[PDB]
Amino acid sequence: GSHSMRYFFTSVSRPGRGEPRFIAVGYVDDTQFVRFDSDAASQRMEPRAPWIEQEGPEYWDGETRKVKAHSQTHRVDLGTLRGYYNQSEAGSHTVQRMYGCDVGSDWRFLRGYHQYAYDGKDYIALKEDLRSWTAADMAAQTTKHKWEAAHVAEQLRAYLEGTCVEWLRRYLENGKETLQRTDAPKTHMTHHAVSDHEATLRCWALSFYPAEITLTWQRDGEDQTQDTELVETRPAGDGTFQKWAAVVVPSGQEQRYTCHVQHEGLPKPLTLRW
Amino acid sequence: GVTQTPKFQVLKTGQSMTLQCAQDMNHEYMSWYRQDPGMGLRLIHYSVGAGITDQGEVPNGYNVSRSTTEDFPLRLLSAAPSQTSVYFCASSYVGNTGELFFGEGSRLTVLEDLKNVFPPEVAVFEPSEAEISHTQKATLVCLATGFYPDHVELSWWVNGKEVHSGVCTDPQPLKEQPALNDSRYALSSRLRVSATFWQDPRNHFRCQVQFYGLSENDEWTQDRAKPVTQIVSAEAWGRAD
Amino acid sequence: QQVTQIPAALSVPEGENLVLNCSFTDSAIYNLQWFRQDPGGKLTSLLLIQSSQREQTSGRLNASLDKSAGSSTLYIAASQPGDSATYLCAVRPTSGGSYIPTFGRGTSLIVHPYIQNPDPAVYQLRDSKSSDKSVCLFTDFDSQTNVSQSKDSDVYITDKCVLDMRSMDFKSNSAVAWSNKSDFACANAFNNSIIPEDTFFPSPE
């Protein structure tokens, strides 16, 4: 299927108790591979997935060096942003950034991203054409104005459109055994009498990878979409994920319902019945 | 901008010196270079952010720190003659244009013996008889001599106002004793005015030389005036021949 | 990777438009920047071309970027003697993670002044405090006249520098010679490249 490399950055200011905190994490598909933490004693980019460890020191020194340059830029963005919204220095604020790329089933380039947020809300983002920006509010008009002045987008193009995907393909083939992997969901079902005139049916999918999955309940073949409780796909802690979907049905009518499980590692869509 | 201090400095071998550098452009990247006479910039240290530093090409005898975004001080633990050189601080964003911004520069001279530091002798030579009649112009020549080190700034003052039009000072000084390693220097400068101007007795000409030598608090014992930073100037007056 | 700038030296007369070359081996760069440095002086930035761009301009300066073929050219309109200096081009890497720039060793530019109607001459100027002590001044000479150095350790000769009398739109070259020695009175001082087409030698007294 598709693949992608993402880099997430978080910076939080601390009113008056040290520098702001910086946290950077890198992913390939649904697998974290690097991380940096201002408060960790390392002060270096750390490996977080088995492949990648084959990368030489020059690589580590580099990413470590680059990611600190990222922390400075953000250290500053925190101050400039207050200024744009003319905010006090008293309360902490948060700055987030997420850039990366996507590749098709054939590893060919598809999309590029470079988004930014302040206090959990969009601030500015690169349009799909990788040439123009979208400013959420008047403060971002300023960031946008100086970005098109400093030909930022033109400079990113190079990265997203190339460097980013080159590295992705690289990590994709060095990590075959982990990344190219597909784990079908260990599946099963639950039944607990909810109310006095009905019983909940919960369809389980466990230890699967990648996280992309589709759990679908049906009644008499027609999928009863509304009335289906879905939990947010959550990690198992071991590199795989778990998820469920449930429906509360009038007791006795349980034979009529059906759960359907779609997943890449699955050769043909499952359908379960109580 | 980027401001470096000091611009001139003299040290005896063994002294610990700190060259300051600061910028107010919120640049994440600051660097230090030393450039020996017409050699080429040589990177000492550089830093991309508060809390980090990395070596360059010649980090020996040089320590560095980046406690804040604005300041990037370079320190020579124990001064050596080999470190006599012109130092350049330079900063830039770690994005945007990525344009370098160099500081003014800092001239250090490390001497194993503070005796050898001499202030300049300054003398002014009056326009020639023949020149004025032959060209209708008058060329005054100022000559600064016997100074060391090569740390001087020369200016011409006419009627109490610094003048620039009609001036040209040697781009650089010349060693009075080229054979010697530590030769004292000389420097000549020319101020050309119109004949009628030089021939007006009211006109006052003055050549001043700012010299950068010893810090007032430096050790000294020679039957000779402590060669401290100072100004030495000579003057001349217009003449109706 | 490697920045090259040849010709390494460049000599021309004022008024001529000129070119300064600059070449780099690794095209993967974020920018190219032109500087200017005069002996004793600092470095002055001239132009800054981002890797995404081409023709950047400032005053009489203009420069192109052909990052594909690892080349940049610095143009200069109507050369002024003030342009005389060392020009450097430096680059910074698109990646590699050090932001450390790379400089070339620069090209030496000397823009000779056009002295319309020259009038070579050697005067003798005297100290305004103590007589005896005097100096020699080769002056008003043509742009095509080198001032070779002294062969005598007791004889000092400063190179030519052009000075400008702006309000009178007049420029002139001049070198200086002097000694503590009890030997010469000008006339002999500049024995080297004299070029006495008309080197007016005043008759002292």
């Binding site: 880099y7 990611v67 990113l156 460097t163 | 770690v94 994005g95 | 993670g97 932001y99």
Partner: peptide
Amino acid sequence: SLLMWITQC
């Protein structure tokens, strides 16, 4: 591999 040049907002 991270991006090398990042512009301040």
